[PDB]
Amino acid sequence: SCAPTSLPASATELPTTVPTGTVITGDYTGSYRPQVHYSPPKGFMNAPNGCHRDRNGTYHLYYQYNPLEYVAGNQHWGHATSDDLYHWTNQPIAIFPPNSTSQVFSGSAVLDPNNTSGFFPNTTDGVVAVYTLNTPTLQVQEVAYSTDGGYNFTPYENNPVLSVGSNQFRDPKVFWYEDHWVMAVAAANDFTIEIYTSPNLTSWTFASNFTHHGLLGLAYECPNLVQVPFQDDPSKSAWLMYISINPGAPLGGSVGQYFPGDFNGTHFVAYDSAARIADFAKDNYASQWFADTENGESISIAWASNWQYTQQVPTSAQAFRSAMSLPRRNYLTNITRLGWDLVSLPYDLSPVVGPSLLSSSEANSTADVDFTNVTSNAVWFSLNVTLPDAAIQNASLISADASINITFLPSTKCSSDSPAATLTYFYAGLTNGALALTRPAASSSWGAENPFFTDKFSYTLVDPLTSLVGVFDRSMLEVFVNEGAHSATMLVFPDSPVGSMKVATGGLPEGTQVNLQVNGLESTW
Amino acid sequence: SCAPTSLPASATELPTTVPTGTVITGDYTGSYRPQVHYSPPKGFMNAPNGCHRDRNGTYHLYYQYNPLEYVAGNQHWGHATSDDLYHWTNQPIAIFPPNSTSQVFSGSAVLDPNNTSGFFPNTTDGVVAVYTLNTPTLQVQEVAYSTDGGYNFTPYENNPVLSVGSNQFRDPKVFWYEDHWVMAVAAANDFTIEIYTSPNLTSWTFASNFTHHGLLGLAYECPNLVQVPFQDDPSKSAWLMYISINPGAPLGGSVGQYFPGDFNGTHFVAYDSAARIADFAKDNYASQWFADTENGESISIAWASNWQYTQQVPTSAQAFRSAMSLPRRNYLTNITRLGWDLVSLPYDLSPVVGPSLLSSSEANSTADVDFTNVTSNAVWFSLNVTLPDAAIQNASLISADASINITFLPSTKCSSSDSPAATLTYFYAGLTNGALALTRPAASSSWGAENPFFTDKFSYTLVDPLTSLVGVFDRSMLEVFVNEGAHSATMLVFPDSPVGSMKVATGGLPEGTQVNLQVNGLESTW
Numbered sequence A: 001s002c003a004p005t006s007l008p009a010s011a012t013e014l015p016t017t018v019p020t021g022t023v024i025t026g027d028y029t030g031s032y033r034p035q036v037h038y039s040p041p042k043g044f045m046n047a048p049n050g051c052h053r054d055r056n057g058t059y060h061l062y063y064q065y066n067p068l069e070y071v072a073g074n075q076h077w078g079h080a081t082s083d084d085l086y087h088w089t090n091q092p093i094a095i096f097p098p099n100s101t102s103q104v105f106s107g108s109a110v111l112d113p114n115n116t117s118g119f120f121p122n123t124t125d126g127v128v129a130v131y132t133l134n135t136p137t138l139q140v141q142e143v144a145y146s147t148d149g150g151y152n153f154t155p156y157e158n159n160p161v162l163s164v165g166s167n168q169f170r171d172p173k174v175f176w177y178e179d180h181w182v183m184a185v186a187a188a189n190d191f192t193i194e195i196y197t198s199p200n201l202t203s204w205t206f207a208s209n210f211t212h213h214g215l216l217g218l219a220y221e222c223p224n225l226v227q228v229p230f231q232d233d234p235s236k237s238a239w240l241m242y243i244s245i246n247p248g249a250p251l252g253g254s255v256g257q258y259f260p261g262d263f264n265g266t267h268f269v270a271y272d273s274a275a276r277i278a279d280f281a282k283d284n285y286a287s288q289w290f291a292d293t294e295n296g297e298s299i300s301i302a303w304a305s306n307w308q309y310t311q312q313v314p315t316s317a318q319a320f321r322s323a324m325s326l327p328r329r330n331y332l333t334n335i336t337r338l339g340w341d342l343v344s345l346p347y348d349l350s351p352v353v354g355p356s357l358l359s360s361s362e363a364n365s366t367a368d369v370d371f372t373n374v375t376s377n378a379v380w381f382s383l384n385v386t387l388p389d390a391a392i393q394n395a396s397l398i399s400a401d402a403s404i405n406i407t408f409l410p411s412t413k414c415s416s417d418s419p420a421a422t423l424t425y426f427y428a429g430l431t432n433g434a435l436a437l438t439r440p441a442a443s444s445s446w447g448a449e450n451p452f453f454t455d456k457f458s459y460t461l462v463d464p465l466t467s468l469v470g471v472f473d474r475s476m477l478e479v480f481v482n483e484g485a486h487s488a489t490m491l492v493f494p495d496s497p498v499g500s501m502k503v504a505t506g507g508l509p510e511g512t513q514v515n516l517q518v519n520g521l522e523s524t525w
Numbered sequence B: 001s002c003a004p005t006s007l008p009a010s011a012t013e014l015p016t017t018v019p020t021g022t023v024i025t026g027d028y029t030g031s032y033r034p035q036v037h038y039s040p041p042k043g044f045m046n047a048p049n050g051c052h053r054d055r056n057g058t059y060h061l062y063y064q065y066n067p068l069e070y071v072a073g074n075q076h077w078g079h080a081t082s083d084d085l086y087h088w089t090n091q092p093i094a095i096f097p098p099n100s101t102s103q104v105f106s107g108s109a110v111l112d113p114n115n116t117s118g119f120f121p122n123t124t125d126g127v128v129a130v131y132t133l134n135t136p137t138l139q140v141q142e143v144a145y146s147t148d149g150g151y152n153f154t155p156y157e158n159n160p161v162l163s164v165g166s167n168q169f170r171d172p173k174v175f176w177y178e179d180h181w182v183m184a185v186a187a188a189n190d191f192t193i194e195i196y197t198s199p200n201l202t203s204w205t206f207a208s209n210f211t212h213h214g215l216l217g218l219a220y221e222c223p224n225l226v227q228v229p230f231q232d233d234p235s236k237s238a239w240l241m242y243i244s245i246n247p248g249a250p251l252g253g254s255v256g257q258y259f260p261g262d263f264n265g266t267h268f269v270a271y272d273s274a275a276r277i278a279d280f281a282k283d284n285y286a287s288q289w290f291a292d293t294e295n296g297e298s299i300s301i302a303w304a305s306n307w308q309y310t311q312q313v314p315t316s317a318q319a320f321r322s323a324m325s326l327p328r329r330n331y332l333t334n335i336t337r338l339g340w341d342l343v344s345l346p347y348d349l350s351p352v353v354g355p356s357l358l359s360s361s362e363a364n365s366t367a368d369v370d371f372t373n374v375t376s377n378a379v380w381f382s383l384n385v386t387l388p389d390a391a392i393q394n395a396s397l398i399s400a401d402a403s404i405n406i407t408f409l410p411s412t413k414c415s416s417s418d419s420p421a422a423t424l425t426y427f428y429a430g431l432t433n434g435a436l437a438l439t440r441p442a443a444s445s446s447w448g449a450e451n452p453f454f455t456d457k458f459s460y461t462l463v464d465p466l467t468s469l470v471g472v473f474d475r476s477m478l479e480v481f482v483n484e485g486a487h488s489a490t491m492l493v494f495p496d497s498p499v500g501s502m503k504v505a506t507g508g509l510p511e512g513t514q515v516n517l518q519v520n521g522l523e524s525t526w
């Protein structure tokens, strides 16, 4: 009737040896366990890896996995599959280290249907994984191949395929460019993305360096060089270098940044010298794009945590640490003044959208929506606000009190009065365009005490807020502003589960059209 | 026995007309009123302006001033003087708008001892102010001059001296380079610093653009192009472009950033394409460097607030909104891995350092220091930690518990609840190795808890272990300087109850670690 806050020992106890060829069973009933986001059956998960779609339309998600602990270490490649990026099936571990003093760090996977690698004489469904093997003294790039659709991998006989004699050289992202393979890889502590080329994925030639761009933090990680279509014109696209930095992000710990530019097969040249942060909150890192997608779709998934507190979050009693972000559709757009912007929207949520909890058209009202009866404890909401053309042509017409206040309130059934999360936007006044996203300290004993668990985040719009999409999923809130122009991923660990949300609008100009839609989400587990 | 939390109406009531040629009297006794930082006698202050040292060694501080309200507006240039940058004397308003429909926005001031301007036929102590005049439709650059040492200014007869037909064109920073005047000015909403040259400060010629560098935010503001000496070698220096952005900073609202590079009199070229943030907290903005300083001293001062909550902070009942940061000595250094770093240390604090409250050498101890008895409610603290060479060579020898925890605790003698007002946590190792957390707990401040932009927690991660930590607490402000000012944070605190105590705990340190803690009370400058 209420989601368990602690699980039986059977569900939380980790084995002393790594299971091979068997699906690790998971209890997904925890009060903090997300129901539409991916999380491992048990153990510790970090970066997504080897993300690709096979020819039959199955999306493969691999991930950094510690099967033995609820902290980072003993890295293997976990594996889950999905047709829709929401209904996940857990698979046996896909890539193992050679021994117990080695770890399988991040990497990518590609289809090799034309058998450029020479691994696939009798199949057009060959998968090649390119990943970092970590040793006490070295980080080297290794190749493994799968003839069975990416469930079981055989190491390349002549591994490693690439080394620079460094233990700060990792996160290979490989893709096809016209007539050759490209590898983007991080010389992490030199703030350099090295680009290599190959005809066969085993012989790598240095092409170019991308160094000392944007925020340095303490390290470049998980580079992604991808072609992203324009939001308003699918026929147009630009190249984007996405770099994860950890530690040393402005909000502390880990953050993603991106650089729009040109790629010609050997060199990436940023259009300008500007730094652009992907997410205005703290809990979005190591975004990886899916290889071999259909229809020029840019599909990404990120790790929904921060390295400053990911190994301390209070979910280990619920048999997991860390979830992935919602899968994302990516576009590029120009926003007023700022220009280049990476758009992020949730990938088609239709497969998980349950019955409507509220549809409202009232301006200057408070909508109270109870979802104690939604067993997932997960809701989607959409708020459209269309100001009259008068208020767009003369912003001085907008009242200083013109505001949107969204609050997520604790459950009356399943447990002090503090909201678990707040969203505040002002159209005008002294903080015009300021959007505040908060996880109040007062709502979480754990969050209050953790010295890196920041309570408050903000983004300032130039254009008025016209659209707001949100997904709440037990311990996670994702917000998308003005068709994904601005995006924030925020973990919440309230003492009491959320059971309710209030949506207040106030001081809106005469003739403002407000449309509020709220739907419960169906659990994927 | 306790600092007033509200003041008499005579002290808070603002006049309806701006006072001319008269010093505005101020009550500096408020529980939130800093005692070693500058704040205006009453009204609302933002960016520092016209910062310069006259030839007799008097530092002139001008500032964006609303004399009529406790919010932004009706901008004039306020004026305060000091020989040591701590003992401030309030002066009459220095620069007035021509009209009630005009505002004096930010700008700089230079000595013109060789009379290049032609304003100073009979003095070598001439001061020229170059500032933005704001009108409803235009932002233009104007000149005013002072023959009396920068107390009274006459507008240039043929103002404005620079206009581009824009209302997003402001914050002129002017300096002498070899044989000509340089102006750095912000084309704010185009994310461009325009550089102009002049022989006489009245005729300006376009030289170069510096565009789309580092974080854009929503606007480039308060550019500073300055020569900053190397920390470890005073004979070496590099040029630095300092740009303030507001809104749209990562932490929200306002932040400073800098670009080391080369300047050749017309063009600034950054050494790389990297973005570098000056302060790891939220309350440091619109840093301006002092013109005409002695030696090779890089001296800066910032506005110690954030535009997201500066007009809502609960200090108006104490007859002021906004203080300046501590004055800062600036250097450039290379830090491990990251490379280029703007060093910030407090300018000579000696003139305000009172009697010692504690000197300790104990490692693995909690030192409790009460300052209920220091009337300023202002303390300076230094913590030096020297790890053994073994731990410097093999960091695996450092325990996961190796930590430094400093807490500023509420007064029991002056109640308005047991929550610290400010915390500092550093880990040498463990899962967050090198992580320094600076916090202002929500639970300690009803106002801070409720304000949706008043962020509780800030962090910076070191590569090198923490070897030095300097801090100044001043009633409503904490400034920390890490590893000889390599890393720096300014943080406002508005606790319900004033701070009366600080705990300094060290724990899990390797065998033979040397710890030296010095804590001194500060003497009020008012």
Ligand SMILES: *[C@@H]1O[C@H](CO)[C@@H](O[C@@H]2O[C@H](CO)[C@@H](O[C@@H]3O[C@H](CO)[C@@H](O)[C@H](O)[C@@H]3O)[C@H](O)[C@H]2NC(C)=O)[C@H](O)[C@H]1NC(C)=O
Binding pocket: B164, B165, B166, B168, B169, B187, B190, B192, B194, B208, B209, B211
């Ligand atoms: C140096 O930088 C300044 C500021 O970036 C440049 O002036 C500016 O030029 C840009 C681009 O031409 C102007 O932007 C455009 O304005 C028009 C007019 O409304 C608009 O229709 C366009 O869509 C675009 O936004 C901008 O107005 C202007 N900024 C000012 C005057 O402050 C200047 O041209 C640069 N000089 C050189 C030699 O690069």
Ligand SMILES: *[C@@H]1O[C@H](CO)[C@@H](O[C@@H]2O[C@H](CO)[C@@H](O)[C@H](O)[C@H]2NC(C)=O)[C@H](O)[C@H]1NC(C)=O
Binding pocket: A164, A166, A168, A169, A187, A190, A192, A194, A209
């Ligand atoms: C491409 O970048 C790499 C990584 O920065 C360069 O290799 C390094 O070179 C620096 C000096 O420039 C050394 O101190 C580092 O130890 C090296 N790091 C690694 C990971 O090798 C490399 O030289 C660059 N190549 C070119 C063509 O410029």
Ligand SMILES: OC[C@H]1O[C@@](CO)(O[C@H]2O[C@H](CO)[C@@H](O)[C@H](O)[C@H]2O)[C@@H](O)[C@@H]1O
Binding pocket: A046, A047, A064, A072, A075, A105, A106, A107, A132, A170, A171, A219, A221, A222, A246, A247, A286, A307
């Ligand atoms: O699991 C290793 C994998 O994670 C990344 C970031 O996704 O690096 C993280 O883990 C590393 C190994 O402990 C740390 O050095 C690094 O600081 C942390 O970000 C990838 O770079 C790596 O492939």
Ligand SMILES: OC[C@H]1O[C@@](CO)(O[C@H]2O[C@H](CO)[C@@H](O)[C@H](O)[C@H]2O)[C@@H](O)[C@@H]1O
Binding pocket: B046, B047, B064, B072, B075, B105, B106, B107, B132, B170, B171, B221, B222, B246, B247, B286, B307
């Ligand atoms: O007092 C104006 C002065 O302040 C700065 C930044 O310190 O700009 C601030 O005030 C402007 C006009 O009031 C705002 O447009 C801006 O957002 C705010 O940062 C300087 O640019 C200006 O000279």
Ligand SMILES: *[C@@H]1O[C@H](CO)[C@@H](O)[C@H](O)[C@H]1NC(C)=O
Binding pocket: A098, A099, A100, A101, A102, A133, A135
């Ligand atoms: C484990 O394998 C890695 C690479 O395969 C190698 O560097 C390491 O020395 C091996 N360890 C042992 C102890 O065999």
Ligand SMILES: *[C@@H]1O[C@H](CO)[C@@H](O)[C@H](O)[C@H]1NC(C)=O
Binding pocket: A117, A118, A199, A200, A202, A203
């Ligand atoms: C990959 O191709 C390169 C050049 O064609 C060659 O040097 C190398 O031997 C090839 N490797 C394999 C295993 O085919």
Ligand SMILES: *[C@@H]1O[C@H](CO)[C@@H](O)[C@H](O)[C@H]1NC(C)=O
Binding pocket: A264, A265, A266, A267, A269
């Ligand atoms: C790609 O562009 C770079 C410079 O941007 C140039 O040096 C290189 O030769 C180009 N390569 C190709 C494949 O055109």
Ligand SMILES: *[C@@H]1O[C@H](CO)[C@@H](O)[C@H](O)[C@H]1NC(C)=O
Binding pocket: A230, A231, A332, A333, A334, A339, A340
């Ligand atoms: C943004 O504007 C620039 C300059 O006009 C243009 O080069 C680019 O194609 C635009 N990007 C998008 C996504 O429209």
Ligand SMILES: *[C@@H]1O[C@H](CO)[C@@H](O)[C@H](O)[C@H]1NC(C)=O
Binding pocket: A382, A383, A384, A467, A483, A515, A517
């Ligand atoms: C809100 O507007 C968006 C376009 O931004 C549109 O996709 C959606 O249909 C609207 N939502 C509702 C439920 O009206």
Ligand SMILES: *[C@@H]1O[C@H](CO)[C@@H](O)[C@H](O)[C@H]1NC(C)=O
Binding pocket: A393, A394, A396, A397
């Ligand atoms: C906006 O309306 C005000 C009165 O509300 C008017 O004085 C001003 O000129 C208008 N501005 C524009 C953009 O027309």
Ligand SMILES: *[C@@H]1O[C@H](CO)[C@@H](O)[C@H](O)[C@H]1NC(C)=O
Binding pocket: A363, A364, A399, A506, A507, A508, A509, A510, A511
């Ligand atoms: C909302 O309130 C504002 C000011 O309070 C008023 O001008 C406007 O008519 C109201 N809108 C509606 C839909 O009631």
Ligand SMILES: *[C@@H]1O[C@H](CO)[C@@H](O)[C@H](O)[C@H]1NC(C)=O
Binding pocket: B098, B099, B101, B102, B133, B135
């Ligand atoms: C003072 O008011 C006049 C009237 O429009 C305006 O033109 C001028 O720009 C204002 N301030 C000054 C003298 O620039």
Ligand SMILES: *[C@@H]1O[C@H](CO)[C@@H](O)[C@H](O)[C@H]1NC(C)=O
Binding pocket: B121, B122
């Ligand atoms: C400077 O002194 C002269 C006489 O030496 C006096 O006439 C004048 O008013 C002063 N300033 C100038 C030259 O206007």
Ligand SMILES: *[C@@H]1O[C@H](CO)[C@@H](O)[C@H](O)[C@H]1NC(C)=O
Binding pocket: B117, B118, B198, B199, B200, B202, B203, B204, B205
């Ligand atoms: C300032 O020098 C300029 C040359 O750029 C000239 O146009 C102007 O006449 C001069 N003004 C003076 C000397 O007052």
Ligand SMILES: *[C@@H]1O[C@H](CO)[C@@H](O)[C@H](O)[C@H]1NC(C)=O
Binding pocket: B264, B265, B266, B267, B269
């Ligand atoms: C300054 O450097 C710029 C950019 O390198 C160059 O265009 C200009 O000629 C230089 N000016 C001088 C005075 O050397």
Ligand SMILES: *[C@@H]1O[C@H](CO)[C@@H](O)[C@H](O)[C@H]1NC(C)=O
Binding pocket: B230, B231, B332, B333, B334, B339, B340
């Ligand atoms: C930092 O390193 C660079 C490259 O070695 C050097 O040129 C520069 O002068 C150094 N800067 C300082 C402040 O030491």
